[PDB]
Amino acid sequence: QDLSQIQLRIQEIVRVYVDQLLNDICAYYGYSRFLAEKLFELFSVSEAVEFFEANEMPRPVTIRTNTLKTQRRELAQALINRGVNLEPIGKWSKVGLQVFESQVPIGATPEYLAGHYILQAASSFLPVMALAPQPNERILDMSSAPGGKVTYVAALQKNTGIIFANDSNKARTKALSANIHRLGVRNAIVCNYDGRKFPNEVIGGFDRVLLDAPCSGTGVIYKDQSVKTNKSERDFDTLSHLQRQLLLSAIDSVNADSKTGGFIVYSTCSITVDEDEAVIQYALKKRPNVKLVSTGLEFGREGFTRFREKRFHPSLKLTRRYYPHVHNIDGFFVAKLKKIS
């Protein structure tokens, strides 16, 4: 069928049928039926159409300036002198710069080589802000790769404290170590061990915990369109189980007696309800000593308390959810938990 005809049929179905709209969306966007049905169930019919349309639009390029090396104003001046159009990424982040046009390559610039700015998604910047690492504190990162979050955490800590970053894949670990060395992080220790065993087999008692658990890629459809058709129910269940295990290990490793506070920040790159809300509910039930706390983000949709037959705890609303159609950034879910004992 013609693409214009399919789009017109989808618009007519949205205006008014559900099966026809899903078939038209699958024909046009090429997404799998299961993924399209889950997205249609999660968001409104108009919201799902907007999310599907926004999934095709390429996200703007975002670069995080290393406060450890150069200031934001100096980086902007250097980018301007290099013939690259950059603007601040909203008001929530004071270092995030969005690049619209760049005559020279962004990653090959002298400042980029020097580590002044590192290319990273704006959503990744939010998890660092939610974690809010403090100087002279022990921060444990469950997923070191690609190192952007670790570099931001070290910059926030002003090269103080100890940042223990773990990466499961050796190939990704080597790149993360290279990025950390380029960024000049001095107190970062990179390990290659399982996150579940990390609380008990390697070390525990981290003052702060940042668990960027791997996601199905629902919010990273534009980056990796293969996940649209490679998503399976069994894979989603396995990812949810792995995320729950990682969250439990992070809670166990977090020291509630730490003077800086046992804060654990869990981040996911998918807007799936069963991946974000269910994992948070499972973690809360498994660890009564962990209580949800405000993420402190000025933007982001509140966590859903009731989705279809599934009902979440009232504290689940504190979670921050971002969507490409809502926040103009890659879909992500952020949850902050504080340990009491």
Binding site: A78, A108, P110, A114, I162, H181, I189, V190, C191
Partner: protein, 174 residues
């Protein structure tokens, strides 16, 4: 992770010395933070005491990186194989030379600093001396061995060669 024995320490403590000279003293001792040298595989790692204390837990084979590398221990027992120490070498640098905008790109690609492309000098630079390369924005660039001296460099042919590239900031992503 393996503690460094005496021979490899004296084998690398001169290697620092052609670049930072006797400036290594602020590195090897610092009362605020007993942040000493550590060795994993053949890569010499400059880390804090707490870094070792956490690193004691992680396995030697598992732990691939720790703090800042100063270079691998080759068979001839020499370094510069990594430039990750550029920030420390630049700060404690005895001798720094500035390379103009024409000379930043051939250095950033690893070609040696041309005479016409030399911007500024320390004015007292011996032959075959370990020096540090800077840009106009006072930013470290890499390590270079200079076989030229200010005394004769002040009157030289542009296309001549002054400082040989050893490592550059481009290698971080190259």
């Amino acid at each position: 992770m393996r503690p460094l024995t005496h021979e490899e320490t004296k084998t690398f403590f001169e290697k620092l010395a052609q670049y930072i000279g006797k400036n290594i003293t602020h590195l090897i001792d610092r009362p605020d933070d007993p942040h000493c040298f550590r060795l994993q595989k053949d890569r010499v790692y400059y880390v804090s005491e707490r870094a070792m204390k956490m690193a004691t837990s992680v396995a030697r084979q598992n732990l691939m990186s720790l703090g800042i590398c100063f270079g691998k221990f080759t068979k001839t027992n020499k370094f510069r194989l990594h430039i990750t120490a550029l920030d420390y070498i630049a700060q404690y640098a005895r001798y720094k030379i500035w390379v103009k905008s024409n000379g930043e790109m051939p250095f950033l690609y690893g070609n040696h600093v041309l005479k016409a492309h030399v911007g500024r000098i320390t004015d007292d630079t011996p032959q075959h001396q370990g020096v540090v390369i800077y840009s106009m924005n006072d930013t470290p660039l890499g390590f270079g061995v200079t076989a030229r001296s200010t005394l004769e460099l002040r009157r030289l042919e542009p296309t001549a060669i002054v400082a040989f590239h050893q490592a550059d900031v481009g290698e971080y992503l190259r």
